[PDB]
Amino acid sequence: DAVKECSWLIEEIVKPQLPNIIDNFSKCLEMLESDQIFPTVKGVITRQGQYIVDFHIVVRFPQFQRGKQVMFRMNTGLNFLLIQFSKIMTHLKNILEILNQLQVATDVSEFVSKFGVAMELLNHSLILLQNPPRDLVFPEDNNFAMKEMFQDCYSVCESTAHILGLELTLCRNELCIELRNLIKVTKLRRGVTFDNRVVMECEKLIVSTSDPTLISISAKLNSLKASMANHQANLVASKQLS
Amino acid sequence: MSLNFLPGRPNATPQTACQATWQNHTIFAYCSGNNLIILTNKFTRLQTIYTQSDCTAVDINSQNGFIALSFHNRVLIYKPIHQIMQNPKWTQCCQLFHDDTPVNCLRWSSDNELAIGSDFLSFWKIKDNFGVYQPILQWNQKQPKPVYNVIISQDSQLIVSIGKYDCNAKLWKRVSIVGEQAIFNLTMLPHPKPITAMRWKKEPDQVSKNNTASHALYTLCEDKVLRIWSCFEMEKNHTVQIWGEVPLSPTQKFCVIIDNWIIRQTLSVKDSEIFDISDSDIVILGSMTGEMEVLALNNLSQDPPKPMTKKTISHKKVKKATMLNDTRYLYLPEIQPYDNVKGKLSFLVHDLQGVIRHLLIDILQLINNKTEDLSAALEHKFTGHNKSVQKLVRSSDGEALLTTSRFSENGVWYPQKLNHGVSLRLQNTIQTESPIKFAVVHELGKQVICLLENGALQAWECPTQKQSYLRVETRLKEEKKIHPIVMLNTPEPKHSHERHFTALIFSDGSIKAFEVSLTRGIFEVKSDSLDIDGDDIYKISIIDPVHQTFVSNRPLISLITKKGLTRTYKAIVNYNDRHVQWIKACEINTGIMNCTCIRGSSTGKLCIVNSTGKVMSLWDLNRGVLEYEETFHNPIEDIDWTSTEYGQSIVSIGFTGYALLYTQLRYDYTNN
Numbered sequence: 001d002a003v004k005e006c007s008w009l010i011e012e013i014v015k016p017q018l019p020n021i022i023d024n025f026s027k028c029l030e031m032l033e034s035d036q037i038f039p040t041v042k043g044v045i046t047r048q049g050q051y052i053v054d055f056h057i058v059v060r061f062p063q064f065q066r067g068k069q070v071m072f073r074m075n076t077g078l079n080f081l082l083i084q085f086s087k088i089m090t091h092l093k094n095i096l097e098i099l100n101q102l103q104v105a106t107d108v109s110e111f112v113s114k115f116g117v118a119m120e121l122l123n124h125s126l127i128l129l130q131n132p133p134r135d136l137v138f139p140e141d142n143n144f145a146m147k148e149m150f151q152d153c154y155s156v157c158e159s160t161a162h163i164l165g166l167e168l169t170l171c172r173n174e175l176c177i178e179l180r181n182l183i184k185v186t187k188l189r190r191g192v193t194f195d196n197r198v199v200m201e202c203e204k205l206i207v208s209t210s211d212p213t214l215i216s217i218s219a220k221l222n223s224l225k226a227s228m229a230n231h232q233a234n235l236v237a238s239k240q241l242s
Numbered sequence: 243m244s245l246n247f248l249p250g251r252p253n254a255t256p257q258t259a260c261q262a263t264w265q266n267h268t269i270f271a272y273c274s275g276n277n278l279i280i281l282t283n284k285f286t287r288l289q290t291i292y293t294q295s296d297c298t299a300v301d302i303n304s305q306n307g308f309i310a311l312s313f314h315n316r317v318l319i320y321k322p323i324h325q326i327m328q329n330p331k332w333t334q335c336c337q338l339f340h341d342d343t344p345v346n347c348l349r350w351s352s353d354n355e356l357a358i359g360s361d362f363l364s365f366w367k368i369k370d371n372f373g374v375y376q377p378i379l380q381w382n383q384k385q386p387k388p389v390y391n392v393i394i395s396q397d398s399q400l401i402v403s404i405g406k407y408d409c410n411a412k413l414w415k416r417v418s419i420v421g422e423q424a425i426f427n428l429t430m431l432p433h434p435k436p437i438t439a440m441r442w443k444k445e446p447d448q449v450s451k452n453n454t455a456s457h458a459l460y461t462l463c464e465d466k467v468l469r470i471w472s473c474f475e476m477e478k479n480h481t482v483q484i485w486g487e488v489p490l491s492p493t494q495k496f497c498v499i500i501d502n503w504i505i506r507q508t509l510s511v512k513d514s515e516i517f518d519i520s521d522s523d524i525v526i527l528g529s530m531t532g533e534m535e536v537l538a539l540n541n542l543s544q545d546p547p548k549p550m551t552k553k554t555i556s557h558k559k560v561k562k563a564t565m566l567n568d569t570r571y572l573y574l575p576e577i578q579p580y581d582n583v584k585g586k587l588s589f590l591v592h593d594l595q596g597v598i599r600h601l602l603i604d605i606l607q608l609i610n611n612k613t614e615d616l617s618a619a620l621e622h623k624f625t626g627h628n629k630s631v632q633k634l635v636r637s638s639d640g641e642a643l644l645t646t647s648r649f650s651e652n653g654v655w656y657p658q659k660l661n662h663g664v665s666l667r668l669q670n671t672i673q674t675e676s677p678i679k680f681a682v683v684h685e686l687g688k689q690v691i692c693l694l695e696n697g698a699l700q701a702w703e704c705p706t707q708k709q710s711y712l713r714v715e716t717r718l719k720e721e722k723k724i725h726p727i728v729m730l731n732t733p734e735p736k737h738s739h740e741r742h743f744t745a746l747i748f749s750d751g752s753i754k755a756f757e758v759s760l761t762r763g764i765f766e767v768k769s770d771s772l773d774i775d776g777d778d779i780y781k782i783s784i785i786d787p788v789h790q791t792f793v794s795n796r797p798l799i800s801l802i803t804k805k806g807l808t809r810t811y812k813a814i815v816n817y818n819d820r821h822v823q824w825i826k827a828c829e830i831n832t833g834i835m836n837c838t839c840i841r842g843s844s845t846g847k848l849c850i851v852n853s854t855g856k857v858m859s860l861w862d863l864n865r866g867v868l869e870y871e872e873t874f875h876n877p878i879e880d881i882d883w884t885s886t887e888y889g890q891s892i893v894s895i896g897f898t899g900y901a902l903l904y905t906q907l908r909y910d911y912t913n914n
Contacts, residue, residue: 005386006410012384013428226479230429233482237410237430 006238007108014111014231015103021224021231022099025118028220029092031213032085039069041207047175047214050085053077055149057177059156059164063202064181066161075151084133084170085214088221091121112235119228122221129173129218138167138180143195146179160184163199173218174211180204244663247281247288250274250626251596255298256391257312257347259592261575262302267330268581268588271309272598273297274626278311278320282330284581285600285622289332291320299348304446308335310356312345317358319368319375336375340364346388352396352452359389363403363414365426380422385412393459395442397452399473400426402459407436411461415478429482431471435464441576443523443543444501456543458485460499466490468497468525470542470550486539486550493529496566498574500524500605502543504587507579508605517555517609524555524609530566533559534616536608555609560616564601569593577603589618596668598624602661619661625668627653635681638731640788642687650674654687654704670704673712680729684742691744691758693729699744701758716756716764724748728782732813732822733794743767743815745822747782747799750774755815755822769821772811775803781837785810787844787885797827797863800842802850806832810842810863830866834859843883845891851878858895860904870904 038046039060046054054077059070098114105111134140146157146166157164157179166179182199185191191198211218252258252272259272270281278291278300291311298312309320309332319336343360350356354369356377362384368377390406400416410430417427440461448454455474462468472485490497502523505514514520519538528534536555541548566572573592580588585606591599600622607617628651635644643655643666650673658667672678672690681692690702690710701714726746732755734743741759748754751771758764780803785796797810809829815822828846836853846863855877860870880896895902 001407009386230427230482234428234430237432240432241409 003238003242006241009238010108010111010235014115014235017227017231018099018103021227022096022103024220024224025092025095025099025122028217028224029089029096031217032092033089036213038213039205041178041205042071043073044209045175045177047082047085047211050089051080051082052175053079055145055177057207059166059179059181059205061164061179061181061203061205063162063183064164064179064205065156065159068159070156070159070164070166070179070181072146072150072153072156072164072166074149078149080145080149084128084136087128088125091118091125094118095121108235109239112232112239115228115235116232119225119232122225122228126218126222126225128170129214130171132168132170136168136170138165138169138178141165141167144168145177147195158195158197162202163195163197165195165199169206169208172208172210174209174214176207176209178204178206180206245286246622246660246663246665247285247624248626248666249279249281249288249290249624250277251628252592252598252624253297254594255347256573257299257301257349258297259573259575259590259598260301261578261588261590262304262307263578264302264304264307265326266579266581267307268578269302269307269330270575270590271300271302272592272624273300273311278309279624280309280332283328287329291332291334293318298345301348301350303350303354305352306354308350308354310338310348310350310358312348312358315339315342315344315360317345317348317356319377321375336368336377338366338368338377340379340382343388346390347392349392349394351394352449355394357392357394357401359385359392359403361385361388363389363392363401363412365401378422381424381426383414383426391437391440393440393442395457396446396449397454398475398478399442399457402431402440402442404437404440409433409436411437411440413459413482417478427478431459431461431482433461433463433469434467438462438464439497441499444503445543446503455480455545458542462497466492466494468527470539472547472550474545486542486552488525488527488537488552490527493531493533494527494535495529496572496574497525497527498577498589500526500577500587504577504579505605508585508587513606517611519553519555519609525552526608528565530568532562532565532616533557534565556611556613558608558613558616560618563599563620564616564618566591567593567595567597569595596625600624621661623658623660623665623667627651632677635683636786636788637683637687638786638788639686639790641790642683644672644681644683644690644692646678646681648677650676652678652692654683654690654710656687669708670706670710671708672702672704672710674700680726680746682729682731682742682744684731685739689742689760691729691742693726693746699756699758699764701760701764703760713760714758714763718754724750724752726754727779728784728799730784730798730813732798732815733792733796734815734817735794737792737794738817741817743817743822745813747779749779750777753822753824757817757820765820767815767820767822769815769819770823772801772824773809773826775801775807775809776805778803780804781840783840783842785842785844789886791844791887796844797842797846800840800848800863802832802837802840804835806835806837808832808840808848808850808861810848828863828866830861830863832859832861833868839878839881841881841883841893843891843893844885845889847883847891847893849881849883849893849895851881860893 042058043056055074064070095118102111102114143165162183169176181203182201185200186198190200261270280289295313317338320332321335323333345360358364365381368375370376387405392403401414410432413429414426418424443458457473459471468488470486474480522539522542526536580586589601589603601618602621632647645653652672654670655666676694676696678692679695697718697720702710703713730745746754751774755767798813800810802808812825812827838851838855842848848861884892
């Protein structure tokens with residue numbers, strides 16, 4: 001006959017569950033958008049909210065720095081911008097705005113679209129947490145945050161004997177920094193134009209670290225996305241029926 | 243004894259009947275108008291519970307034997323008065339009221355849990371105090387429309403609902419891990435067509451923890467497709483996906499499932515080896531033509547995911563009564579074992595035409611691949627009269643019965659031979675303008691003649707639908723001085739079926755001998771008035787055989803007077819003369835003046851209850867000698883005599899609640 005009852009039932013089903021998800025998403029997003037407490041490499045680094053501007057880690061690549069450990073200590077620290085958390089914060093803000101505005105939407109289609117967009121954003125954030133961003137991975141990092149951000153990084157990461165470009169290993173749902181050391185090349189497999197001088201990989205100093213604050217946010221986002229999956233399926237079922 | 247009940251016509255609700263295996267007593271229950279019917283021990287005992295409202299649904303607690311019965315805006319809970327005994331009995335124990343919505347469907351689950359869906363799918367529990375069983379509305383929520391059918395599993399799997407003509411089943415899982423006010427998590431479970439039926443798989447062994455996976459859901463879609471949906475705990479991550487599909491052929495119209503529970507309880511390990519299908523449940527797809535195919539699922543309950551599929555087992559085919567009597571819909575309560583009778587499954591059918599059927603299929607024969615037609619045989623049938631029976635009128639051939647009420651709901655029934663004794667079978671309904679005071683049946687039940695208290699004599703033909711076509715009618719003058727007291731079908735000197743000369747005995751004499759017939763209208767005959775024996779007939783009783791005897795030479799009425807001058811009068815009538823004559827065949831002068839009841843047989847016997855009603859005197863009409871005299875502590879409510887072409891007379895003396903049967907005993911030459 002008509003799925004009008006199905007469309008209107010979102011208020012009596014989705015609405016009671018709406019705050020339980022909106023508040024959780026807002027709580028998860030607050031942590032990422034605010035300052036918070038935060039051989040082998042040495043030292044530690046911290047990420048301030050969304051953008052990390054403090055780094056004190058070093059490198060211990062056997063092939064790096066012509067055999068010397070690349071202690072590219074930051075020159076007292078410098079400002080930096082991180083897009084991994086920026087996208088998550090933007091998605092969370094958009095989800096909060098949707099929950100605030102379309103929650104009383106006359107047409108359930110707008111609310112369903114907002115919920116689907118929020119769920120897709122949460123899934124994208126989870127995926128980005130699973131593996132490092134495209135520009136943060138060592139192969140496509142171009143020695144970012146290790147050639148200029150770190151003091152004396154020109155030789156600490158671009159030594160004549162070999163390069164020591166550092167990379168961010170954000171593949172464990174947490175922030176981490178590592179480096180791979182490659183001998184000078186390109187004066188294919190080794191490289192083409194890595195940091196203007198492709199270097200054949202010869203050693204690595206991969207180090208894995210956890211995120212005390214990002215782990216909880218990622219877990220909350222995963223749970224919220226799991227709930228939103230069922231919510232979106234139920235919402236779309238009524239629309240498909242009519 | 244082989245006593246067969248007709249407790250009451252069942253309702254048309256989907257949950258109007260439920261079979262349940264409480265402690266292996268295989269309870270059965272169903273709703274009939276203002277009554278609930280509970281058949282306990284192999285359906286050999288009955289308990290009826292009266293409630294002043296139409297009963298919507300009924301469900302039975304497998305764990306503890308509690309009955310939940312819906313009606314109007316409330317539900318009643320009955321419990322076994324004694325939790326264990328060879329003859330269980332149910333008594334009222336609790337009441338449920340939530341809102342002003344009739345409880346359209348209701349069910350039961352573990353530990354006194356109920357899903358009483360009316361329009362809101364109320365969920366509750368009742369089992370507190372020292373036995374108050376005070377309920378607790380643990381949850382409540384609204385629905386798009388009233389719930390046509392609901393289902394509840396044990397533990398976390400929680401509940402599912404559909405609503406009438408609904409295409410998506412609202413699955414509400416027990417989302418909250420703890421807390422009485424648990425909130426239930428939603429899922430839609432879209433289907434391509436409205437749900438025809440559904441049910442959960444069975445796994446009682448998981449108790450008492452109840453935390454288990456693979457709570458598969460069976461659901462038949464309106465598109466001739468059975469569907470099995472996988473389920474698992476997985477931290478509530480499973481599941482709203484269809485695990486297996488089974489498209490039924492165009493011939494197929496009905497489907498039923500036998501769980502691994504029944505097979506495991508029935509088949510032995512040695513017998514289980516063939517056809518070796520004990521790894522999953524069984525599905526039987528049947529058609530109205532009778533033909534049916536039985537198949538077995540592959541890993542339909544395996545905890546790890548498996549590639550479920552339909553694997554055929556056998557292609558059977560049983561008689562018409564074994565599948566369906568051309569009904570519009572059939573509701574098939576869960577097939578369960580017939581108590582400790584190994585190898586027999588108590589298959590039930592709800593025909594939605596006033597009849598429930600109990601079949602007792604033999605499982606080993608059902609799955610027999612190298613097997614013939616189905617062996618199912620009608621074991622019980624359940625039905626009942628519409629309102630009430632004021633009187634029972636018997637055809638003298640004994641092959642037809644007319645149930646008459648204070649209203650126009652008269653019915654013509656025929657005895658039906660089941661595999662377990664005999665049971666009546668309504669064949670027609672004789673609609674009347676007013677109550678029938680007297681009647682007589684002929685033509686093996688196909689023709690009926692009746693006299694109403696209004697005085698109208700009406701003749702119906704009943705050749706088939708259940709409609710009874712009134713073919714002839716006439717009326718009397720109702721002088722309000724004399725009144726009819728019996729109707730005797732005076733046999734014609736020769737076997738004649740064209741007309742049936744019916745004699746109305748207007749108290750003292752005045753035998754209105756109407757030459758009633760169907761092809762031609764009713765007539766009137768003058769001859770003749772018999773000796774009223776004091777101008778006032780005192781408790782006349784008819785004489786009739788109960789066997790197909792065509793003899794016309796027979797005494798018809800055993801009159802009696804307050805002076806005890808019993809007289810059996812023969813009947814003689816001439817069709818050409820249009821007159822009838824009354825002849826006193828016997829005139830035994832009884833020793834009792836005031837008699838409670840009187841009756842006589844075709845074999846010349848007679849029975850009279852004294853004025854006090856506590857003494858029965860059996861008299862010989864061919865000798866006038868009191869053959870028997872007994873004193874009973876209770877009054878004799880009625881008497882009735884059977885017979886046969888071999889003189890096997892039996893007399894039933896009907897007391898308040900039980901009827902004794904007495905039979906002649908040979909005179910022993912050398913004994914007393």
